């Protein structure tokens, strides 16, 4: 199941060798300055240079910030974790706001852990019935091998029950444990700090900052310098940053000045507004003066009418149907009348009604009749 | 005697490298 969403045509950023511009770069078209401003910071993401930075996105509704917010994470792959979180999930009744924010910061910052282990399996023969010598046979499909082991291991086997000719994990059921005499394996995976904080809370939830800071950072410091753990942070994305309480703004532009803080990309859509919790404030982009001195403001341009064909062509490629000249002309006209989201919205039911009526292509009269069927939000 | 959904419901990096990271084992060191 592919489950094609709205922003499913976006593959990556599409920077060639220097990172300036391309038109058909396997995704969203246009927006040269935004692509440069998001292609500068991925070297800081992959290089682990600074911490506690902020990225501010601004523009009208319809610039496609979700497409670039996906493309900045798909270029990183599965190496860097990406966990988006809007301000609606920060709002809660039982659990407080700053606890959910700290769990988001622990979902951002991650670890890489390697481990080498030796695994023994196969059926066993014993002869021992404790003076420094334990005979252990090991039979597998590759053959037989005899080993000398310590009497403490034989005492630990004597603690439980040992069947004559069973499968014992030395570190009717279980038929044929296929494998050689020893398995020496080195596996590297990733660790999220949210699961570690849950396991510290519930081994089998408001927290005090002592276990949060020191009891994690001391064992991280003791495990990096040995050569096991590697600290890899993540990139957060907060959509609708202007719809937040001012206490959340104080917490954000305090926590961005900390020594341990990942990079967070803000998304501010609306212009001047009243900040919730306070009155008589007409600050730009719903953001006070303190946070504006910390964020990186990125201005997004407006899409040209020539690039609407480049938007609709990759969507027709994703759907899998061709568009005629008059149909593309009418779609371009209704994409110049209103926003392009209305042009993307009328791609699926036109194809479905053409499949019902028996039309392999898209007719200008067909999209005219389905525009007569329902009208846009502008003329409501 | 009805029942709606259940007959009976259905409901490797670990390996001794993360239990030492946790202090939530029976030993409470203090």
């Amino acid at each position: 199941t592919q489950r094609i969403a709205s922003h499913s045509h976006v593959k990556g950023l599409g920077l060639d060798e220097s990172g300036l511009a391309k038109q058909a770069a396997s995704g969203l078209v246009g927006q040269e300055n935004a692509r440069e401003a998001c292609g500068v910071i991925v070297e800081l993401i992959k290089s682990k240079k600074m911490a506690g930075r902020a990225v501010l996105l601004a523009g009208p509704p319809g610039t496609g910030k979700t497409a670039l917010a996906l493309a900045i994470a798909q270029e990183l792959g599965s190496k860097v974790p990406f966990c988006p979180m809007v301000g609606s999930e920060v709002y809660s009744t039982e659990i407080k706001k700053t606890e959910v924010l700290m769990e988001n910061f622990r979902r951002a910052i991650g670890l890489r852990i390697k481990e080498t282990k030796e695994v023994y399996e196969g059926e066993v023969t014993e002869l021992t019935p404790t003076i420094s010598h334990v005979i252990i046979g090991l039979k597998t499909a590759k053959g037989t091998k005899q080993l000398k082991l310590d009497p403490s291991i034989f005492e630990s086997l004597q603690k439980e029950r040992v069947e004559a000719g069973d499968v014992i994990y030395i570190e009717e059921y279980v038929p044929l444990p296929k494998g050689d005499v020893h398995k020496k394996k080195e596996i590297i995976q990733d660790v999220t700090l949210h699961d570690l904080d849950v396991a510290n809370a519930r081994p089998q939830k408001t927290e005090i900052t002592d276990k949060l800071r020191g009891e994690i950072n001391k064992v991280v410091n003791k495990y990096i310098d040995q050569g096991i753990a590697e600290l890899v942070p993540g990139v957060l994305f907060v959509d609708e940053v202007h719809m937040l309480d001012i206490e959340c703004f104080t917490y954000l532009h305090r926590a961005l000045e900390s020594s341990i803080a990942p990079i967070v990309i803000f998304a501010s859509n609306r212009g001047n507004c009243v900040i919730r919790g306070t009155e008589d404030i007409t600050s730009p982009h719903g953001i006070p003066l303190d946070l504006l001195d910390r964020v990186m403001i990125i201005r997004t341009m407006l899409y040209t009418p020539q690039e609407m064909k480049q938007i609709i062509k990759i969507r027709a490629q994703t759907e899998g149907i061709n568009i005629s000249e008059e149909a593309l002309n009418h779609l371009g006209e209704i994409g110049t009348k209103t926003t392009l989201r209305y042009s993307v919205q009328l791609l699926t039911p036109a194809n479905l009604l053409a499949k019902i009526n028996g039309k392999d292509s898209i007719e200008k009269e067909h999209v005219e009749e389905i525009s007569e069927l329902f009208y846009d939000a502008k003329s409501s | 005697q009805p029942v709606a959904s259940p007959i009976g419901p259905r409901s490797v990096l670990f390996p001794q490298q993360r239990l030492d990271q946790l202090s939530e084992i029976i030993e409470r060191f203090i």
């Binding site: 969403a5 009744t93 659990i95 479905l352 939000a377 | -």
Partner: protein, 366 residues
């Protein structure tokens, strides 16, 4: 005398369209609303196909067009349907984010094909050796029933289970939380990542499949801005069921803030709604739907009474004229007659009144 016999606007079975998706003038469903029922049939065909996600359809019009009847017709013609109100997600133990998330994730259904091996029956031993109180077989290898899972039968079971596996993985037992709502805000990584990985493994192994659902949210004239900020990500998520919003009021100030916007929505949800407007009923359409609703409780009317009933229902509300035949059938039953008259419906109109009658007579203000 069973539980549902008649209520509000739901008497028609299914929805009524054709091969060319054109509604008739005398068929199943309602009379009129060609463009509205046509767009409803188009989006219902989109639900039946299930190609993309994030399809939010807004319906609007004058109060009295019967959006609930259209929703019930699309529900009966439809797969898990869910119709919620605007105050069900507003809870005290849960937040305004978790309850709307549980309302979203409940419409998603999962079909599970499970093949098990069962050896059941009655005992005839004890102490180890297994036989039966059989009809068929023997050969060991009193009165109680023992079932052993790996006579011998390979049983295939089809399960239609919602996403409440998220309810049973976080829980300890399956008896407590499976009968009410549940706990507070849980681990969202456990909701997203492990569930998506295990359902993807079930798709790769070919054991279970998933189907989307429909969520009808009525009376969206009042809604806090937290849900409007949540729908920015909810419509742009990886997976989401289809949403049908119903808004009655045109211009209404949003509670908590002070703005002037159509349908009580911001600019972010403005371009995300397939908006369908309606048309008020004419003379012949009102007379024909009254002829339809006369066949509900087996009530016959005289020839000169339909014009009076339509004349009352045109100036006043339509649902008042729907209630007039029910309020007059009891008077006709007490009259001991098989046919109503003009004086009966005039007496019922003199007894029960509407807002237009009570507007003038409340000038006392004592």
């Amino acid at each position: 005398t069973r539980i549902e016999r008649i209520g509000a606007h739901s008497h028609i079975r299914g929805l009524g369209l054709d091969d060319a998706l054109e509604p008739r003038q005398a068929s199943q469903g309602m009379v009129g609303q060609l463009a509205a029922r046509r767009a409803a049939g188009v989006v219902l065909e989109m639900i039946r196909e299930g190609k993309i996600a994030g399809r939010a359809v807004l319906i609007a019009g004058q109060p009295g067009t019967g959006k609930t009847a259209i929703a019930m017709g699309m529900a009966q013609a439809l797969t898990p349907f869910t119709a919620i109100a605007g105050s069900e997600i507003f809870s005290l133990e849960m937040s305004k984010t978790e309850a709307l998330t549980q309302a979203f994730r409940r419409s998603i259904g999962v079909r599970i094909k499970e093949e098990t091996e069962i050896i059941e029956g009655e005992v005839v031993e004890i102490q180890g050796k297994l036989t039966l109180k059989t009809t068929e077989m023997e050969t060991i290898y009193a009165g109680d029933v023992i079932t052993i899972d790996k006579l011998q039968k390979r049983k295939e079971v089809v399960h239609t289970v919602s996403l409440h596996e998220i309810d049973v993985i976080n829980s300890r037992t399956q008896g407590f939380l499976a009968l009410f709502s549940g706990d507070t805000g849980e681990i969202k990584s456990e909701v997203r990542e492990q569930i998506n990985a295990k359902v993807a493994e079930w798709r790769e192994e070919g054991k279970a499949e998933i189907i989307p659902g429909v969520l009808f949210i009525d009376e969206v004239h009042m809604l806090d801005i937290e849900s409007f900020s949540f729908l920015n990500r909810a419509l742009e998520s990886d997976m989401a069921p289809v949403l049908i919003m119903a808004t009655n009021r045109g211009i209404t100030r949003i509670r908590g803030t002070s703005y002037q916007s159509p349908h009580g929505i911001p600019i972010d949800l403005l371009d995300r709604l397939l908006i369908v407007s309606t048309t008020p009923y004419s003379e012949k359409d009102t007379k024909q739907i009254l002829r339809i609703r006369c066949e509900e409780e087996d009530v016959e009317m005289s020839e000169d009474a339909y014009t009076v009933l339509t004349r009352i229902g045109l100036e006043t509300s339509l649902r008042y004229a729907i209630q007039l035949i029910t309020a007059a059938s009891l008077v006709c039953r007490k009259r001991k007659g098989t046919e109503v008259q003009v004086d009966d419906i005039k007496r019922v109109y003199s007894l029960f009144l509407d807002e237009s009658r009570s507007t003038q007579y409340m000038k006392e203000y004592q």
